Swiss-Prot record:
GO terms for biological process: chromosome segregation; DNA replication; error-free translesion synthesis; error-prone translesion synthesis; mitotic sister chromatid cohesion; response to radiation. It comes from Saccharomyces cerevisiae (strain ATCC 204508 / S288c) (Baker's yeast). DNA polymerase specifically involved in DNA repair. Plays an important role in translesion synthesis, where the normal high fidelity DNA polymerases cannot proceed and DNA synthesis stalls. Plays an important role in the repair of UV-induced pyrimidine dimers. Depending on the context, it inserts the correct base, but causes frequent base transitions and transversions. It catalyses: DNA(n) + a 2'-deoxyribonucleoside 5'-triphosphate = DNA(n+1) + diphosphate. It is found in: Nucleus. Residues 26-309 form the UmuC domain. The gene is RAD30. This is DNA polymerase eta.
Amino acid sequence: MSKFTWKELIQLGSPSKAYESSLACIAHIDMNAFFAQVEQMRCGLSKEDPVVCVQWNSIIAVSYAARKYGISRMDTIQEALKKCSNLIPIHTAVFKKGEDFWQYHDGCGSWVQDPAKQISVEDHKVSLEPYRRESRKALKIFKSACDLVERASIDEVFLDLGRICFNMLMFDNEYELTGDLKLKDALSNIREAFIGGNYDINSHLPLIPEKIKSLKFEGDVFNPEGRDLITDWDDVILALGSQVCKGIRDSIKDILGYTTSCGLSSTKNVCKLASNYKKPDAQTIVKNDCLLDFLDCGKFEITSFWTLGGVLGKELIDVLDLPHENSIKHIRETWPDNAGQLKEFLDAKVKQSDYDRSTSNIDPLKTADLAEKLFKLSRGRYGLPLSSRPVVKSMMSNKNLRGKSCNSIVDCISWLEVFCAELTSRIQDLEQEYNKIVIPRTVSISLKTKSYEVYRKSGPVAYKGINFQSHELLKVGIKFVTDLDIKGKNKSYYPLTKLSMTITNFDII
């Protein structure tokens, strides 16, 4: 009999619990060099053109076509032009001082000789709205194919393929394994057992039928040890999941023209790593039996994992005295039998005299959770739910001013119009992306004078109706900017060096 039970398989049908199943099928999809792709498609260019998304003299996104010339975000536009003769830099859309809308200025930029075709940093501000808009289009497509999608970022998402995979496995009557073999015939035994209902949930699943081995994996199956492809039900779910992923990625490509790289495995952490394994346009599959081979391939360390890439991770390296190479395997073999072993080790470490609870990132009252977390991560079996990111706590729009771009109250207001438009688009994005009305109640305006003095004024903002944020924000901002203008009537004030509008106290309805 299979090593998995009916409960584990059935659990895939649960949106809230599927991620806990050892048969889970999670995917991570990335739209790489996204900003460059957006500009590429906007101007009708191909993925073969060396496009680079630009900002003033910096590069903020490098197409993979341009990376082939050794160009990166560390290069200035001029340096990149030297590395690539047929380079196509495209400046980001920008707001102009005093206007409440962004605009593209193709054919303009620091690299163009013509003095009449420049995009001055003094009276302009980059807008990333075009990218947020394109991202929302992709999200809609992802959400249309999968009932549980996590927007990890503007160019990355997680998908829980549980329901789709479970239903394909049990009810898909069209899918074809071969020209003479249908998925339904290959799996008649388990499908009949499922509808049969004569099983205990803790009973093991029957062995996979030899015919399901004809099922193909779509993408690259990370398998340096040459293990068999389909050996148990977890491989079957995963293979079905790869077919589904490809279809979803094909939809993003055909509708929007955006390429993606994808990672598929049984947990969020592993599929995210797999996603960045072959960064161009690819799909990497990590079978459960290949989890250790993958984690020990040489590219990863304990600090490669989600929450361990910062101060906590650095502390664990010291606390657990881990090597700088193969820390993952080290953790596995140093506490091989159970998490409790690691817990005991941690409990001894926390009681050590040199331990400083005051500045430690480790919680001495929850060593059980940490131990289990590390025990599992090191084996590629730590499942986390696809959660919908925390409510925006604060949004800021600011501008480090050069020269006299803000030489008076009229200038301050002109900049606030830009800031308000920015924050407004960003609020509407959070509203759509998560279908929720976001109303800010507190507004804070800060600024730095010519003499580097800092003035700040916070205060409540009204809501004379639905999405009115724009007009309302501006009005309160203009009042504060005027109030501070007067507070600095007798002082070297106006050639301002900085100005910012910050909104907080969010009321999500």
